């Protein structure tokens, strides 16, 4: 019936079950982690099966070395323990955890987490090849390991580690049209000018949702536009111990219209900022590692408050930029900021925690 995701440690003596690999943030609440950890032998019974969640900033290396990767910066950490179960749980086990404990024996112990909404959304960036940068991101990691205490020497062989994605969602607020007008006067125009207008239909868009951009142009100068341009280039900034202002144009389209002097022209253009169109590192920001296709473009970061975002992960912001290739003398352009976000009995089926891909 319903799907359940599980991952087993290489030492299969311990395993973890989850209800969903990706967690949605509603800008005021995050759905909790509703897992359960199973150990068949209790692992000699003198150990406590801690399950730790960490949200840490990254920079430099994924190779586990020290150069730059020393910036592993745990922005949040919790240490729920399962066996012994501690006095009373934080809210009763959900029905999913109950059915998991039914399908499994008595050797399965639940664990519950809650993530404050101030934490960054799970996003990672890969510089272009080789654009002088380093890999970085904000990953959420579950480490269910059995030990006698919290500070015991955790090791991979007997500890299962799996990664969660904290995507963000906000309501489709009927905000005002994000207008963007400009008027260009020329040195030789004798008071004439090129007019230009633009406006999105909506202010917020979900992944894969096409963007519609209004265009209005009226020409008063003696210069004709040869062709126009539309792009949704991504603005990504590494605000923690770096200044890398990545500027990759994730999606662009070309369409050749012409407007002579004393001519007016208005239209609407459709664009679709999509990751799978160009699955290249390209020095752009992702919501998850680009090795698997269950990821999309990084969701635009809401500043919120709480000491802004300088130490709280990397920011990404989108805006549609359109420009006119006038015959000879200008490249007048426009910018239209917006925000992009993630769109949002029978027995159980054990899906694997392997993030499928094409390679």
């Amino acid at each position: 019936g319903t799907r359940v995701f599980k991952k087993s440690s290489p030492n299969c003596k311990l395993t973890v079950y989850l209800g969903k690999r990706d967690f949605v943030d509603h800008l005021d609440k995050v759905d909790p982690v509703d897992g359960v950890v199973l150990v068949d032998p209790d692992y000699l019974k003198d150990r406590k099966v801690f399950v730790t969640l960490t949200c840490a900033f990254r920079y430099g290396r994924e190779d586990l070395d020290v150069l730059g990767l020393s910036f592993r910066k745990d922005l949040f950490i919790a240490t729920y323990q399962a066996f012994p179960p501690m006095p009373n749980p934080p809210r009763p086990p959900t029905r999913l955890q109950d059915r998991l404990l039914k399908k499994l024996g008595q050797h399965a112990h639940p664990f519950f987490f809650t993530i404050p909404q101030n934490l960054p959304c799970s996003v990672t960036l890969q510089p272009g090849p080789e654009d002088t940068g380093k890999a970085c991101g904000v990953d959420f990691e579950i480490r269910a390991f059995c030990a006698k205490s919290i500070e015991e020497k955790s090791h991979k062989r007997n500890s299962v580690r799996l990664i969660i994605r904290k995507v963000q969602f906000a309501p489709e607020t009927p905000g005002p049209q994000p207008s963007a007008e400009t008027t260009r006067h020329f040195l030789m125009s004798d008071r004439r000018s090129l007019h230009l207008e633009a406006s999105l239909d909506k202010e917020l868009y979900y992944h894969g949702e096409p963007l519609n951009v209004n265009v209005h142009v009226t020409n008063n100068s003696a210069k004709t536009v040869k062709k126009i341009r539309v792009s949704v280039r991504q603005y990504a900034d590494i605000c923690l111990f770096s200044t890398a202002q990545y500027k990759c144009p994730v999606a662009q389209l070309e369409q050749d219209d012409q407007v002579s002097p004393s001519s007016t022209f208005c239209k609407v253009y459709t664009i679709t900022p999509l990751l799978s169109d160009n699955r290249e590192k390209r020095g752009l920001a992702l919501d998850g590692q680009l090795k698997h296709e269950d990821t999309n473009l990084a969701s635009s970061t809401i500043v919120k408050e709480g000491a802004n975002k300088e130490v709280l992960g990397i920011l990404v912001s989108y805006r549609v930029k359109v420009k006119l290739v006038v015959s000879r003398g200008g490249d007048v352009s426009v910018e239209l900021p917006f925000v992009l976000m993630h769109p949002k009995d029978d027995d159980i089926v054990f899906e694997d925690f392997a993030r499928l891909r094409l390679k």
Partner: antibody
Framework: SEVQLVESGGGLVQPGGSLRLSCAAS????????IHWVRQAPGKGLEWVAS????????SYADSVKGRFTISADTSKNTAYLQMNSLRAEDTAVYYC?????????????????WGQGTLVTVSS | DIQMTQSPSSLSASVGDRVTITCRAS??????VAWYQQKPGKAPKLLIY???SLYSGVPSRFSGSRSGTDFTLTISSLQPEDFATYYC??????????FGQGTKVA
Amino acid sequence: SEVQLVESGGGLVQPGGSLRLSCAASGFNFSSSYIHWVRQAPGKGLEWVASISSYYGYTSYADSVKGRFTISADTSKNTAYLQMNSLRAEDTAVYYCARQGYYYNSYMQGALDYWGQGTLVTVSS
Amino acid sequence: DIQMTQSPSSLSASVGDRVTITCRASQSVSSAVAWYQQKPGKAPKLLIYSASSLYSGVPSRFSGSRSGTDFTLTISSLQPEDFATYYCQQSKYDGLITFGQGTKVA
């Protein structure tokens, strides 16, 4: 400290009347545990009635009491009420308040660890 | 709801004997049962949970066992404490509970 589950409020009412059973709890947080009301007719086996969880607000009722009983949890007073309406002769049972256990050495699933003293609810003329 | 059956509903053994009580399930129950011992005119105390796990305040003499869809309770040695009525309970779901008719162990 010990969880002294205790209930009170039951009395005598002719059929079709109303009454509010109260279940005072202590020694544990109300949110983390389910509450079940289990009744017992005179000289008969127990019978489930209804259940509520304060944190989830998930109510459920037995078939015979599907639209006659109402169970509500008031976390402020650390108590869960069962407001009964349209009582009839068969509801002359004694009613208990029970709390599911979460862990002793495993995940006892619906074990009703702690029971109250029981309140008698007579329904007669 | 789930129909849960106990049999037989009346027994009699002497102090120091060994006793068996069987409770049957009309639907697949994933070992999610528990037995209650009710002294006359008292709140039913818990006996065992998960169909095999013991509970505090109960001597190790009680030991249930799941043998498929059926369920069963064993008492290695009957004592005066065991004069009561025993109730099998099914708890497959979260909010749904059902009890058996109970057995009067004279």
